[PDB]
Structures are given as C-alpha cells and as structure tokens.
mmCIF file of N, CA, C and O (backbone and C1' of nucleotides) in Angstrom:
data_model
loop_
_atom_site.group_PDB
_atom_site.id
_atom_site.type_symbol
_atom_site.label_atom_id
_atom_site.label_comp_id
_atom_site.label_asym_id
_atom_site.label_seq_id
_atom_site.Cartn_x
_atom_site.Cartn_y
_atom_site.Cartn_z
ATOM 1 N N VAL A 1 -3.327 -61.099 29.766
ATOM 2 C CA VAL A 1 -3.120 -59.758 29.158
ATOM 3 C C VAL A 1 -2.612 -58.832 30.242
ATOM 4 O O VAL A 1 -3.272 -58.617 31.251
ATOM 5 N N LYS A 2 -1.445 -58.282 30.005
ATOM 6 C CA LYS A 2 -0.829 -57.391 30.975
ATOM 7 C C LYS A 2 -0.874 -55.984 30.463
ATOM 8 O O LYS A 2 -0.579 -55.759 29.303
ATOM 9 N N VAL A 3 -1.236 -55.044 31.329
ATOM 10 C CA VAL A 3 -1.265 -53.648 30.972
ATOM 11 C C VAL A 3 -0.041 -53.063 31.658
ATOM 12 O O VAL A 3 0.143 -53.259 32.848
ATOM 13 N N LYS A 4 0.761 -52.351 30.885
ATOM 14 C CA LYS A 4 1.989 -51.730 31.363
ATOM 15 C C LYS A 4 1.823 -50.227 31.292
ATOM 16 O O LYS A 4 1.262 -49.669 30.346
ATOM 17 N N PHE A 5 2.299 -49.567 32.331
ATOM 18 C CA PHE A 5 2.155 -48.146 32.429
ATOM 19 C C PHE A 5 3.044 -47.639 33.556
ATOM 20 O O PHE A 5 3.549 -48.410 34.358
ATOM 21 N N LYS A 6 3.171 -46.325 33.606
ATOM 22 C CA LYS A 6 3.980 -45.679 34.634
ATOM 23 C C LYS A 6 3.068 -44.777 35.456
ATOM 24 O O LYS A 6 2.292 -43.996 34.897
ATOM 25 N N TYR A 7 3.176 -44.887 36.773
ATOM 26 C CA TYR A 7 2.342 -44.089 37.651
ATOM 27 C C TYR A 7 3.200 -43.563 38.813
ATOM 28 O O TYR A 7 3.853 -44.355 39.490
ATOM 29 N N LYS A 8 3.171 -42.257 39.054
ATOM 30 C CA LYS A 8 3.976 -41.651 40.130
ATOM 31 C C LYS A 8 5.437 -42.078 40.032
ATOM 32 O O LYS A 8 6.047 -42.377 41.038
ATOM 33 N N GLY A 9 5.988 -42.141 38.829
ATOM 34 C CA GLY A 9 7.376 -42.533 38.681
ATOM 35 C C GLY A 9 7.696 -44.020 38.779
ATOM 36 O O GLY A 9 8.867 -44.369 38.680
ATOM 37 N N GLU A 10 6.709 -44.899 38.972
ATOM 38 C CA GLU A 10 6.994 -46.341 39.049
ATOM 39 C C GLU A 10 6.445 -47.067 37.811
ATOM 40 O O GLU A 10 5.265 -46.886 37.476
ATOM 41 N N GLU A 11 7.269 -47.890 37.150
ATOM 42 C CA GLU A 11 6.802 -48.643 35.979
ATOM 43 C C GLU A 11 6.029 -49.817 36.568
ATOM 44 O O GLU A 11 6.500 -50.494 37.492
ATOM 45 N N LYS A 12 4.834 -50.059 36.051
ATOM 46 C CA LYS A 12 3.994 -51.102 36.579
ATOM 47 C C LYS A 12 3.486 -52.032 35.482
ATOM 48 O O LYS A 12 3.426 -51.647 34.320
ATOM 49 N N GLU A 13 3.117 -53.248 35.870
ATOM 50 C CA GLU A 13 2.575 -54.261 34.959
ATOM 51 C C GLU A 13 1.438 -54.878 35.715
ATOM 52 O O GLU A 13 1.661 -55.440 36.781
ATOM 53 N N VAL A 14 0.219 -54.833 35.199
ATOM 54 C CA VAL A 14 -0.855 -55.426 35.967
ATOM 55 C C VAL A 14 -1.655 -56.307 35.023
ATOM 56 O O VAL A 14 -1.932 -55.912 33.898
ATOM 57 N N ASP A 15 -2.022 -57.498 35.486
ATOM 58 C CA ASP A 15 -2.783 -58.389 34.628
ATOM 59 C C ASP A 15 -4.229 -57.882 34.629
ATOM 60 O O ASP A 15 -4.718 -57.464 35.678
ATOM 61 N N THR A 16 -4.925 -57.955 33.485
ATOM 62 C CA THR A 16 -6.306 -57.473 33.454
ATOM 63 C C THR A 16 -7.219 -58.208 34.433
ATOM 64 O O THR A 16 -8.248 -57.675 34.843
ATOM 65 N N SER A 17 -6.870 -59.439 34.805
ATOM 66 C CA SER A 17 -7.695 -60.133 35.774
ATOM 67 C C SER A 17 -7.691 -59.454 37.169
ATOM 68 O O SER A 17 -8.543 -59.747 38.000
ATOM 69 N N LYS A 18 -6.762 -58.531 37.411
ATOM 70 C CA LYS A 18 -6.684 -57.824 38.699
ATOM 71 C C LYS A 18 -7.399 -56.450 38.616
ATOM 72 O O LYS A 18 -7.563 -55.763 39.626
ATOM 73 N N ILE A 19 -7.815 -56.060 37.416
ATOM 74 C CA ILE A 19 -8.454 -54.751 37.254
ATOM 75 C C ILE A 19 -9.814 -54.721 37.900
ATOM 76 O O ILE A 19 -10.636 -55.614 37.666
ATOM 77 N N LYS A 20 -10.061 -53.722 38.729
ATOM 78 C CA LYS A 20 -11.328 -53.626 39.419
ATOM 79 C C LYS A 20 -12.344 -52.768 38.702
ATOM 80 O O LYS A 20 -13.462 -53.196 38.535
ATOM 81 N N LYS A 21 -11.968 -51.546 38.321
ATOM 82 C CA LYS A 21 -12.889 -50.609 37.635
ATOM 83 C C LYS A 21 -12.147 -49.980 36.507
ATOM 84 O O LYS A 21 -10.949 -49.760 36.640
ATOM 85 N N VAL A 22 -12.846 -49.682 35.399
ATOM 86 C CA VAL A 22 -12.208 -49.024 34.246
ATOM 87 C C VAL A 22 -13.150 -47.950 33.778
ATOM 88 O O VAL A 22 -14.354 -48.157 33.769
ATOM 89 N N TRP A 23 -12.638 -46.772 33.470
ATOM 90 C CA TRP A 23 -13.477 -45.709 32.942
ATOM 91 C C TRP A 23 -12.725 -44.869 31.934
ATOM 92 O O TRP A 23 -11.500 -44.989 31.762
ATOM 93 N N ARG A 24 -13.465 -44.044 31.226
ATOM 94 C CA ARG A 24 -12.820 -43.166 30.270
ATOM 95 C C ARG A 24 -12.763 -41.742 30.814
ATOM 96 O O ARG A 24 -13.767 -41.246 31.323
ATOM 97 N N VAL A 25 -11.557 -41.132 30.796
ATOM 98 C CA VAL A 25 -11.429 -39.708 31.176
ATOM 99 C C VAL A 25 -10.821 -39.013 29.942
ATOM 100 O O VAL A 25 -9.665 -39.226 29.555
ATOM 101 N N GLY A 26 -11.655 -38.214 29.281
ATOM 102 C CA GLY A 26 -11.195 -37.606 28.043
ATOM 103 C C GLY A 26 -10.884 -38.693 27.005
ATOM 104 O O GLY A 26 -11.781 -39.433 26.590
ATOM 105 N N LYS A 27 -9.637 -38.802 26.564
ATOM 106 C CA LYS A 27 -9.252 -39.830 25.596
ATOM 107 C C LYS A 27 -8.316 -40.843 26.262
ATOM 108 O O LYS A 27 -7.551 -41.563 25.603
ATOM 109 N N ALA A 28 -8.353 -40.871 27.588
ATOM 110 C CA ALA A 28 -7.533 -41.799 28.328
ATOM 111 C C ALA A 28 -8.420 -42.848 29.001
ATOM 112 O O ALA A 28 -9.580 -42.571 29.287
ATOM 113 N N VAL A 29 -7.844 -44.013 29.263
ATOM 114 C CA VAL A 29 -8.506 -45.129 29.944
ATOM 115 C C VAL A 29 -7.830 -45.224 31.310
ATOM 116 O O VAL A 29 -6.618 -45.503 31.416
ATOM 117 N N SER A 30 -8.642 -45.008 32.342
ATOM 118 C CA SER A 30 -8.182 -44.967 33.718
ATOM 119 C C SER A 30 -8.759 -46.170 34.456
ATOM 120 O O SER A 30 -9.876 -46.632 34.163
ATOM 121 N N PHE A 31 -8.023 -46.648 35.458
ATOM 122 C CA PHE A 31 -8.519 -47.839 36.156
ATOM 123 C C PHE A 31 -7.959 -48.036 37.548
ATOM 124 O O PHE A 31 -6.984 -47.354 37.941
ATOM 125 N N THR A 32 -8.598 -48.929 38.297
ATOM 126 C CA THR A 32 -8.056 -49.316 39.605
ATOM 127 C C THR A 32 -7.773 -50.844 39.470
ATOM 128 O O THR A 32 -8.317 -51.545 38.593
ATOM 129 N N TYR A 33 -6.938 -51.369 40.348
ATOM 130 C CA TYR A 33 -6.620 -52.778 40.298
ATOM 131 C C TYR A 33 -6.276 -53.228 41.691
ATOM 132 O O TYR A 33 -5.886 -52.427 42.553
ATOM 133 N N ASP A 34 -6.434 -54.526 41.917
ATOM 134 C CA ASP A 34 -6.135 -55.069 43.221
ATOM 135 C C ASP A 34 -4.643 -55.328 43.326
ATOM 136 O O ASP A 34 -3.997 -55.847 42.428
ATOM 137 N N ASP A 35 -4.096 -54.939 44.459
ATOM 138 C CA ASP A 35 -2.683 -55.114 44.707
ATOM 139 C C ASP A 35 -2.596 -55.766 46.102
ATOM 140 O O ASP A 35 -2.106 -55.174 47.049
ATOM 141 N N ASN A 36 -3.074 -57.006 46.195
ATOM 142 C CA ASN A 36 -3.114 -57.750 47.457
ATOM 143 C C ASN A 36 -3.526 -56.828 48.581
ATOM 144 O O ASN A 36 -2.700 -56.444 49.406
ATOM 145 N N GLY A 37 -4.796 -56.449 48.601
ATOM 146 C CA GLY A 37 -5.249 -55.601 49.681
ATOM 147 C C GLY A 37 -5.436 -54.161 49.279
ATOM 148 O O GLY A 37 -6.564 -53.661 49.318
ATOM 149 N N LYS A 38 -4.364 -53.468 48.915
ATOM 150 C CA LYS A 38 -4.565 -52.092 48.533
ATOM 151 C C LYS A 38 -4.972 -51.993 47.069
ATOM 152 O O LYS A 38 -4.767 -52.902 46.262
ATOM 153 N N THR A 39 -5.587 -50.872 46.751
ATOM 154 C CA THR A 39 -6.091 -50.637 45.419
ATOM 155 C C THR A 39 -5.160 -49.656 44.747
ATOM 156 O O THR A 39 -4.882 -48.577 45.260
ATOM 157 N N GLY A 40 -4.643 -50.066 43.602
ATOM 158 C CA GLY A 40 -3.745 -49.200 42.864
ATOM 159 C C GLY A 40 -4.532 -48.504 41.764
ATOM 160 O O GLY A 40 -5.653 -48.884 41.457
ATOM 161 N N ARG A 41 -3.891 -47.523 41.154
ATOM 162 C CA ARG A 41 -4.493 -46.742 40.082
ATOM 163 C C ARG A 41 -3.530 -46.711 38.918
ATOM 164 O O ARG A 41 -2.303 -46.789 39.116
ATOM 165 N N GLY A 42 -4.079 -46.612 37.704
ATOM 166 C CA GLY A 42 -3.226 -46.485 36.533
ATOM 167 C C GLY A 42 -4.040 -45.880 35.419
ATOM 168 O O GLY A 42 -5.254 -45.797 35.540
ATOM 169 N N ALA A 43 -3.383 -45.464 34.327
ATOM 170 C CA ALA A 43 -4.133 -44.929 33.211
ATOM 171 C C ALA A 43 -3.227 -45.014 31.969
ATOM 172 O O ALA A 43 -2.003 -44.882 32.082
ATOM 173 N N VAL A 44 -3.827 -45.267 30.814
ATOM 174 C CA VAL A 44 -3.059 -45.300 29.589
ATOM 175 C C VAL A 44 -3.848 -44.565 28.513
ATOM 176 O O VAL A 44 -5.073 -44.341 28.636
ATOM 177 N N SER A 45 -3.142 -44.213 27.435
ATOM 178 C CA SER A 45 -3.785 -43.637 26.271
ATOM 179 C C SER A 45 -4.691 -44.752 25.688
ATOM 180 O O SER A 45 -4.321 -45.916 25.702
ATOM 181 N N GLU A 46 -5.861 -44.397 25.188
ATOM 182 C CA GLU A 46 -6.701 -45.423 24.590
ATOM 183 C C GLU A 46 -5.902 -46.136 23.499
ATOM 184 O O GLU A 46 -6.079 -47.326 23.266
ATOM 185 N N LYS A 47 -4.998 -45.432 22.832
ATOM 186 C CA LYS A 47 -4.227 -46.102 21.796
ATOM 187 C C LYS A 47 -3.193 -47.085 22.310
ATOM 188 O O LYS A 47 -2.700 -47.913 21.538
ATOM 189 N N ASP A 48 -2.867 -47.051 23.598
ATOM 190 C CA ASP A 48 -1.933 -48.025 24.147
ATOM 191 C C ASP A 48 -2.636 -49.093 24.977
ATOM 192 O O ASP A 48 -1.976 -49.910 25.608
ATOM 193 N N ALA A 49 -3.967 -49.070 25.025
ATOM 194 C CA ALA A 49 -4.650 -50.079 25.810
ATOM 195 C C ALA A 49 -4.843 -51.355 24.994
ATOM 196 O O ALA A 49 -5.207 -51.287 23.815
ATOM 197 N N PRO A 50 -4.631 -52.512 25.626
ATOM 198 C CA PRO A 50 -4.829 -53.775 24.898
ATOM 199 C C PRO A 50 -6.349 -53.903 24.692
ATOM 200 O O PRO A 50 -7.147 -53.393 25.508
ATOM 201 N N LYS A 51 -6.757 -54.609 23.639
ATOM 202 C CA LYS A 51 -8.200 -54.764 23.407
ATOM 203 C C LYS A 51 -8.936 -55.277 24.608
ATOM 204 O O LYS A 51 -10.067 -54.824 24.925
ATOM 205 N N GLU A 52 -8.347 -56.211 25.354
ATOM 206 C CA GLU A 52 -9.065 -56.728 26.486
ATOM 207 C C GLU A 52 -9.475 -55.647 27.507
ATOM 208 O O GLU A 52 -10.550 -55.688 28.081
ATOM 209 N N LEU A 53 -8.620 -54.658 27.714
ATOM 210 C CA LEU A 53 -8.964 -53.594 28.661
ATOM 211 C C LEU A 53 -10.076 -52.727 28.053
ATOM 212 O O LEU A 53 -11.011 -52.320 28.763
ATOM 213 N N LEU A 54 -9.973 -52.417 26.764
ATOM 214 C CA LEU A 54 -11.024 -51.621 26.113
ATOM 215 C C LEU A 54 -12.361 -52.361 26.156
ATOM 216 O O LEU A 54 -13.432 -51.748 26.238
ATOM 217 N N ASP A 55 -12.299 -53.685 26.036
ATOM 218 C CA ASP A 55 -13.533 -54.460 26.129
ATOM 219 C C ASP A 55 -14.156 -54.353 27.508
ATOM 220 O O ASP A 55 -15.395 -54.304 27.660
ATOM 221 N N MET A 56 -13.294 -54.340 28.537
ATOM 222 C CA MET A 56 -13.760 -54.197 29.892
ATOM 223 C C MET A 56 -14.437 -52.824 30.032
ATOM 224 O O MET A 56 -15.498 -52.694 30.681
ATOM 225 N N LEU A 57 -13.861 -51.810 29.401
ATOM 226 C CA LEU A 57 -14.458 -50.463 29.447
ATOM 227 C C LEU A 57 -15.816 -50.458 28.743
ATOM 228 O O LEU A 57 -16.783 -49.903 29.256
ATOM 229 N N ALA A 58 -15.882 -51.094 27.583
ATOM 230 C CA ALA A 58 -17.150 -51.050 26.809
ATOM 231 C C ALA A 58 -18.234 -51.774 27.611
ATOM 232 O O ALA A 58 -19.418 -51.345 27.645
ATOM 233 N N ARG A 59 -17.857 -52.862 28.257
ATOM 234 C CA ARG A 59 -18.842 -53.623 29.039
ATOM 235 C C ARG A 59 -19.331 -52.764 30.218
ATOM 236 O O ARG A 59 -20.501 -52.746 30.560
ATOM 237 N N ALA A 60 -18.416 -52.030 30.841
ATOM 238 C CA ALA A 60 -18.792 -51.165 31.939
ATOM 239 C C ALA A 60 -19.809 -50.106 31.480
ATOM 240 O O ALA A 60 -20.723 -49.743 32.250
ATOM 241 N N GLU A 61 -19.616 -49.571 30.289
ATOM 242 C CA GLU A 61 -20.510 -48.538 29.808
ATOM 243 C C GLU A 61 -21.926 -49.080 29.579
ATOM 244 O O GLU A 61 -22.903 -48.303 29.615
ATOM 245 N N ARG A 62 -22.033 -50.391 29.340
ATOM 246 C CA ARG A 62 -23.347 -51.029 29.087
ATOM 247 C C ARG A 62 -24.025 -51.578 30.333
ATOM 248 O O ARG A 62 -25.244 -51.810 30.313
ATOM 249 N N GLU A 63 -23.280 -51.784 31.417
ATOM 250 C CA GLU A 63 -23.841 -52.368 32.642
ATOM 251 C C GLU A 63 -24.999 -51.578 33.215
ATOM 252 O O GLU A 63 -24.962 -50.360 33.223
ATOM 253 N N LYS A 64 -25.988 -52.312 33.711
ATOM 254 C CA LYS A 64 -27.187 -51.756 34.348
ATOM 255 C C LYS A 64 -26.995 -51.948 35.857
ATOM 256 O O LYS A 64 -27.726 -51.359 36.678
ATOM 257 O "O5'" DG B 1 -7.013 -22.274 36.649
ATOM 258 C "C5'" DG B 1 -7.620 -23.425 37.231
ATOM 259 C "C4'" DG B 1 -8.811 -23.869 36.423
ATOM 260 C "C3'" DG B 1 -9.570 -24.970 37.140
ATOM 261 O "O3'" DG B 1 -10.932 -24.892 36.731
ATOM 262 C "C1'" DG B 1 -8.595 -25.886 35.180
ATOM 263 P P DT B 2 -11.983 -25.941 37.318
ATOM 264 O "O5'" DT B 2 -12.113 -27.006 36.143
ATOM 265 C "C5'" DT B 2 -12.842 -26.672 34.961
ATOM 266 C "C4'" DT B 2 -13.023 -27.889 34.084
ATOM 267 C "C3'" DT B 2 -13.649 -29.086 34.786
ATOM 268 O "O3'" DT B 2 -14.789 -29.492 34.040
ATOM 269 C "C1'" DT B 2 -11.622 -29.757 33.675
ATOM 270 P P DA B 3 -15.763 -30.618 34.616
ATOM 271 O "O5'" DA B 3 -15.168 -31.911 33.919
ATOM 272 C "C5'" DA B 3 -15.173 -31.992 32.519
ATOM 273 C "C4'" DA B 3 -14.483 -33.254 32.074
ATOM 274 C "C3'" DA B 3 -14.778 -34.457 32.953
ATOM 275 O "O3'" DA B 3 -15.594 -35.364 32.257
ATOM 276 C "C1'" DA B 3 -12.456 -34.323 32.326
ATOM 277 P P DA B 4 -16.717 -36.160 33.061
ATOM 278 O "O5'" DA B 4 -15.930 -37.391 33.728
ATOM 279 C "C5'" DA B 4 -15.574 -38.536 32.976
ATOM 280 C "C4'" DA B 4 -15.196 -39.672 33.905
ATOM 281 C "C3'" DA B 4 -16.059 -39.917 35.151
ATOM 282 O "O3'" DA B 4 -16.145 -41.335 35.348
ATOM 283 C "C1'" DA B 4 -13.821 -39.443 35.836
ATOM 284 P P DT B 5 -16.983 -41.924 36.560
ATOM 285 O "O5'" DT B 5 -15.916 -42.008 37.721
ATOM 286 C "C5'" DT B 5 -14.826 -42.874 37.535
ATOM 287 C "C4'" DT B 5 -13.845 -42.694 38.660
ATOM 288 C "C3'" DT B 5 -14.447 -42.604 40.065
ATOM 289 O "O3'" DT B 5 -14.472 -43.918 40.593
ATOM 290 C "C1'" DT B 5 -12.457 -41.237 39.706
ATOM 291 P P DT B 6 -14.546 -44.187 42.178
ATOM 292 O "O5'" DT B 6 -13.035 -44.130 42.658
ATOM 293 C "C5'" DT B 6 -12.093 -44.913 41.979
ATOM 294 C "C4'" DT B 6 -10.712 -44.537 42.426
ATOM 295 C "C3'" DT B 6 -10.539 -44.549 43.941
ATOM 296 O "O3'" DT B 6 -10.003 -45.800 44.364
ATOM 297 C "C1'" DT B 6 -9.467 -42.641 42.872
ATOM 298 P P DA B 7 -9.850 -46.109 45.955
ATOM 299 O "O5'" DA B 7 -8.375 -45.678 46.281
ATOM 300 C "C5'" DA B 7 -7.301 -46.083 45.464
ATOM 301 C "C4'" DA B 7 -6.046 -45.362 45.891
ATOM 302 C "C3'" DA B 7 -5.705 -45.526 47.368
ATOM 303 O "O3'" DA B 7 -4.290 -45.574 47.408
ATOM 304 C "C1'" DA B 7 -6.077 -43.196 46.889
ATOM 305 P P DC B 8 -3.541 -45.928 48.774
ATOM 306 O "O5'" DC B 8 -3.366 -44.519 49.512
ATOM 307 C "C5'" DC B 8 -2.486 -43.544 48.963
ATOM 308 C "C4'" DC B 8 -2.721 -42.181 49.573
ATOM 309 C "C3'" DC B 8 -2.784 -42.153 51.104
ATOM 310 O "O3'" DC B 8 -1.533 -41.963 51.712
ATOM 311 C "C1'" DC B 8 -4.346 -40.621 50.098
ATOM 312 O "O5'" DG C 1 -11.194 -29.245 52.266
ATOM 313 C "C5'" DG C 1 -11.021 -28.851 50.889
ATOM 314 C "C4'" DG C 1 -9.574 -29.035 50.504
ATOM 315 C "C3'" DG C 1 -9.286 -28.742 49.030
ATOM 316 O "O3'" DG C 1 -7.955 -28.261 48.931
ATOM 317 C "C1'" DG C 1 -8.989 -31.071 49.435
ATOM 318 P P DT C 2 -7.297 -27.996 47.492
ATOM 319 O "O5'" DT C 2 -6.395 -29.293 47.311
ATOM 320 C "C5'" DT C 2 -5.345 -29.537 48.225
ATOM 321 C "C4'" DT C 2 -4.487 -30.670 47.735
ATOM 322 C "C3'" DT C 2 -3.997 -30.467 46.303
ATOM 323 O "O3'" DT C 2 -2.616 -30.809 46.275
ATOM 324 C "C1'" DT C 2 -5.103 -32.548 46.479
ATOM 325 P P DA C 3 -1.807 -30.706 44.899
ATOM 326 O "O5'" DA C 3 -1.472 -32.215 44.553
ATOM 327 C "C5'" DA C 3 -0.782 -33.051 45.444
ATOM 328 C "C4'" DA C 3 -0.630 -34.399 44.783
ATOM 329 C "C3'" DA C 3 -0.049 -34.295 43.376
ATOM 330 O "O3'" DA C 3 0.784 -35.422 43.184
ATOM 331 C "C1'" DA C 3 -2.243 -35.191 43.228
ATOM 332 P P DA C 4 1.651 -35.553 41.848
ATOM 333 O "O5'" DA C 4 0.800 -36.589 40.978
ATOM 334 C "C5'" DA C 4 0.654 -37.899 41.449
ATOM 335 C "C4'" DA C 4 -0.287 -38.653 40.549
ATOM 336 C "C3'" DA C 4 -0.100 -38.425 39.047
ATOM 337 O "O3'" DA C 4 0.601 -39.534 38.515
ATOM 338 C "C1'" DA C 4 -2.449 -38.434 39.742
ATOM 339 P P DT C 5 1.401 -39.386 37.138
ATOM 340 O "O5'" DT C 5 0.282 -39.700 36.051
ATOM 341 C "C5'" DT C 5 -0.132 -41.029 35.885
ATOM 342 C "C4'" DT C 5 -1.359 -41.087 35.021
ATOM 343 C "C3'" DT C 5 -1.264 -40.300 33.708
ATOM 344 O "O3'" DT C 5 -0.797 -41.187 32.679
ATOM 345 C "C1'" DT C 5 -3.468 -40.141 34.799
ATOM 346 P P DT C 6 0.007 -40.583 31.423
ATOM 347 O "O5'" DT C 6 -1.122 -40.232 30.373
ATOM 348 C "C5'" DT C 6 -1.952 -41.259 29.859
ATOM 349 C "C4'" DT C 6 -2.935 -40.659 28.893
ATOM 350 C "C3'" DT C 6 -2.313 -39.899 27.716
ATOM 351 O "O3'" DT C 6 -3.141 -40.177 26.592
ATOM 352 C "C1'" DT C 6 -3.671 -38.431 29.008
ATOM 353 P P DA C 7 -2.924 -39.420 25.186
ATOM 354 O "O5'" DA C 7 -3.665 -38.021 25.381
ATOM 355 C "C5'" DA C 7 -5.046 -37.979 25.497
ATOM 356 C "C4'" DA C 7 -5.532 -36.555 25.429
ATOM 357 C "C3'" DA C 7 -4.826 -35.581 24.481
ATOM 358 O "O3'" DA C 7 -5.825 -35.231 23.546
ATOM 359 C "C1'" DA C 7 -5.402 -34.568 26.584
ATOM 360 P P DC C 8 -5.470 -34.292 22.288
ATOM 361 O "O5'" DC C 8 -6.096 -32.918 22.750
ATOM 362 C "C5'" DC C 8 -7.503 -32.897 22.951
ATOM 363 C "C4'" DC C 8 -7.914 -31.738 23.811
ATOM 364 C "C3'" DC C 8 -7.518 -30.389 23.232
ATOM 365 O "O3'" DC C 8 -8.391 -29.984 22.200
ATOM 366 C "C1'" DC C 8 -7.353 -30.506 25.637
#
DNA sequence: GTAATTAC
DNA sequence: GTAATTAC
C-alpha cells in the first residue's frame, strides 16, 4: 500500500511499511516515515488515506 | 493562529 | 522558534 502526497513542493510515494508514526491533526492524517536514515514527514486528507494507513492510526489511538 | 507533531 | 501538513 503506497501513500501518495505532496510535501514542500515534492510529489512523494511512500509504502506504509516505512511509516513510523501516524496521528490525527484536525481532519488530516499526518505521519513520519523512514527514508533510509532520515525521517520524512507527510500528511493527507483523511478522505485520501488508504484504509491501511487509517488502520495504523486507529491502532495507535488504542496502544497502551 | 491552533490543531499534533515533526524536521530543521 | 519556525515551517509544514489539511481544515477550520
């Protein structure tokens, strides 16, 4: 599952297996991902997020 | 400006 | 401390 989005003017594609953290800001889904060493950031409208990313968010909200 | 949270 | 994300 690839999440596609634009950040700082660059179109990006990141596989959900590289996503490190996911959270909700307002009605947007924001996240960090591994980029071979550095950590990237991205965010999409909840309506453009693939179910797999939303599932990752829901699981995060339940974690102890 | 704030929201959540980060890289920078 | 700020810029970035979608949305208000």
